[PDB]
Amino acid sequence: STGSATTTPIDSLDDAYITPVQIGTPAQTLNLDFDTGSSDLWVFSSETTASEVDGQTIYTPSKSTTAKLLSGATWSISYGDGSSSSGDVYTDTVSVGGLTVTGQAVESAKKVSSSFTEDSTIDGLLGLAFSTLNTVSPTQQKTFFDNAKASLDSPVFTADLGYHAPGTYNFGFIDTTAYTGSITYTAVSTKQGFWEWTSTGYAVGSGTFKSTSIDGIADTGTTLLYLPATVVSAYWAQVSGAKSSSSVGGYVFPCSATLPSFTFGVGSARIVIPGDYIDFGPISTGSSSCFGGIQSSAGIGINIFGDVALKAAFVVFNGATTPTLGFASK
Ligand SMILES: OC[C@@H]1CNC[C@H]1c1ccsc1
Ligand SMILES: OC[C@H]1CNC[C@@H]1c1ccsc1
């Protein structure tokens, strides 16, 4: 089997991407944030505290003939940005882009933090990291990808995020029309539960490539590119008037600037992030200070290849017995 679904930016900045997902019988379609940095499929629901729902579409398990309470199971998750959610668990039929999994754990939110309530465009998350990070207790649950894997034509999914445009998540096949040149594959460590890999270095604009190992995670559910302070300082030093603002919480730059590109290494290959991808717009409406898309990972304890980096590539998440990542230009 295969599945293919379009993923759409939630706003004009590509702050996140939503993908329609069918849950239950008859289908209830929710728009979920596909997150290769976490391993829970959780939804706004009929169980979510009413004051914490503001415009989201909810899953109502009592309206699904295939929903079953997973008795005794609870979940609770805290994300890198400080947001959180928790609740109980159902099993149900979940389909993505024509690919169906029966008995998928659907984690129903009883509580969500203010950042989820305040974002009406995201109805929940669909985690695509390794199932070792799944938070369900006392019986850990499998991701949608892990449940689908054995049925797929090839044990892979791919992320093709758009810049200010829709893109695609594919399951079980590699669309050879969706990228240019060849896919370069690179080793993955699953020791922390992430799609963790080592970039071979970077360049700023037309500058010379610096060969240096940068361990980090491929994370569709993080907006920005978070890299070591040395690398980030080298990038923003090429932008007149850029500075790190403690008051704003990262690097800002004059909105009048033209940003340089950023290149990252994948083995001997190179992925170029155009400068425009690194502009996240005014810090507040009408401001001439703009937020940078490349930020320091200092204090996060990990480097994150988030959407800024991944949207510049066609990315293969290869779930073979020894997982690997692939990157192609497009
Ligand atoms: O902020 C949410 C991030 C999206 N993926 C999971 C999460 C993260 C990244 C590194 S540790 C936790
Ligand atoms: O802050 C909670 C959500 C509101 N908008 C995006 C954000 C999120 C956190 C992890 S994935 C998406």
Instruction: State the distance from the centre of ligand 1 to the C-alpha of 54, rounded, in angstroms.
Output: 23
249 Cβ contact list (under 8 Å, min separation 6): none
Rounded CA-CA distance 163/313 in Å is 11
Torsion of CA 178, 179, 183, 187, to 10 degrees: -70
52 Cβ contact list (under 8 Å, min separation 6): 111, 112, 116, 117
| DSSP structure string for 264-309 | EEETTEEEEE-GGGGEEEESSTT-SEEEESEEE-TTTTSEEE-HHH
Long-range contacts formed by 50-58: CB under 8 A, 24+ apart: 52/111, 52/112, 52/116, 52/117, 53/117, 54/117, 54/118, 54/120, 55/120, 56/120, 56/122, 56/123, 57/28, 57/29, 57/30, 57/31, 57/123, 58/30, 58/123
Q: Are 296 and 229 in contact (CB under 8 A)?
A: yes
| Number of neighbours of residue 246 by Cβ within 10 angstroms | 6
Domains, the chain, with CATH or none: 5-174 (2.40.70.10), 175-330 (2.40.70.10)
Cβ-in-10-Å burial (0-12, 13-18, 19+) of 104 comes to buried
Q: Comparing C-alpha atoms, which of 16, 36, 6 is closest to residue 280?
A: 16
225 Cβ contact list (under 8 Å, min separation 6): 262, 273, 278, 293, 294, 295, 304, 305, 306, 308, 309
Residue 269: C-alpha distances to residues 206, 266, 328 (Å)? 16, 5, 9
Instruction: Dig out the tokens for 83 from the structure.
Output: 């947001």
| DSSP structure string for 61-83 | GGG-TT-EEEEEEEEEEE-TTS-
Distance spanning both ends of the chain, measured CA to CA: 25
Instruction: State the distance from the centre of ligand 1 to the C-alpha of 220, rounded, in angstroms.
Output: 9
Q: Is the CB of 126 under 6 A from ligand 2?
A: no
Q: Is the CB of 16 under 6 A from ligand 2?
A: yes
Rounded CA-CA distance 227/81 in Å is 16
Lining residues, ligand 1, CB within 6 Å: 35, 37-38, 79-81, 219, 221-222, 302, 304
Q: Does the N-terminal peptide bond of residue 26 adopt cis geometry, omega within 30 degrees of 0? A: yes
At residue 199, φ and ψ (nearest 5 deg) are: -70, 150
Instruction: Dig out the tokens for 102 from the structure.
Output: 């029966």
Q: Is the CB of 123 under 6 A from ligand 2?
A: no
Instruction: Dig out the tokens for 66 from the structure.
Output: 């295939």
The length of the chain in residues reads 330
| Number of neighbours of residue 289 by Cβ within 10 angstroms | 16
Instruction: State the distance from the centre of ligand 2 to the C-alpha of 85, rounded, in angstroms.
Output: 11
Q: What's the angle, vertex CA 149, arms to CA 147 and CA 153, rounded to 5? A: 145
Q: Comparing C-alpha atoms, which of 252, 248, 304, 243 is closest to residue 278?
A: 252
| Number of neighbours of residue 133 by Cβ within 10 angstroms | 17
Q: Resolution to 1 decimal, in Å?
A: 1.1
Rounded CA-CA distance 141/247 in Å is 40
